[PDB]
Amino acid sequence: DAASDLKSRLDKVSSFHASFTQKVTDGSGAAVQEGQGDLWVKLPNLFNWHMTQPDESILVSDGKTLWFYNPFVEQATATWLKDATGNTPFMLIARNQSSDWQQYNIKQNGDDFVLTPKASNGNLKQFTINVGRDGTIHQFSAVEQDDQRSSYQLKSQQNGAVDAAKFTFTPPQGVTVDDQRKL
Template sequence: MADANLQNRLNKINGFHASFIQKLITAEGIVLHRDEGDIWVKRPNLFNWHVIVPDESILISDGKALWFYTPLLEQVTVTWLDQAISSMPFILITNNNAKELSKYHVKQSGDFFYLTPKSQNDALKKLMINISPRGMIGSFSWVNQDGLISFYRLKNNCSAFNVSKFVFLLPEGVTVDDQRQ
């Protein structure tokens, strides 16, 4: 029942833009790293994850390829999105594929959904999504097998944006590491 409720709420998301704060936290509650930026999502599988502070980086999915650009290094790495899906818990929010959700045990407490992988080989230990009945995501987090917690709080969530956000335009002079073999 909880998995159906989560899928129903996720299906209400066509797309959104929000500012985010990301924290990498130890199991003891010590903040190791903090990022701020903006995220744009259009389902299925289109997203632009732009970290602005402290070091700029951009992760763009055009639905087929995944582009990771680090302006400071003047480098972009490109892979096939379907090859990266298993290492990205965030993908559950961006795609419409119930098959991905079926890989998890789902429990619900109000607007909070707790997911644990059915596979013991998964690098992910658990995932939490805070999503309203209208499909508005307030926060999400995951815990890796090593106990590190990645926590994301979304704010100023809105649905109006330009779809050009999901096209990576290669800046001049940037080194390309193309791993789409």
């Protein structure tokens, strides 16, 4: 079905590099922010969303830990990546697991998909994505529990092995680290 069709199209492009424009709303239409950025993905769970405009930042997953670094405050936050599953759009695409797509109600129409959560086990209200049968993600968006909309419009995609270094992070000297990984 539409759920299996979605996992298959995404399996078409195991690793890639993409450029995106970000449009964030507020449920009230009044734009909250804007920006652009680069996205590196490597199925199963590696990804690196590196925004540049207006505020440069990095959300990188090494498969085990999720790192959020914002140089505008020497701040890096660390959480176990498993505690992040199904809470962000980058999470669902990166993971791209049957088990993930299962917890949603999906409606497809060509390359458009609209996913709505069945129960309550996440921070998302709605996730949409436009992916071609070739695995090419032209765009996707998300809506959190506070009706906030985050929409990403593709500009350029290049399937193919991605540099492994793009999926690692080491907190710099002098940077304040908030390691929320209980252990």
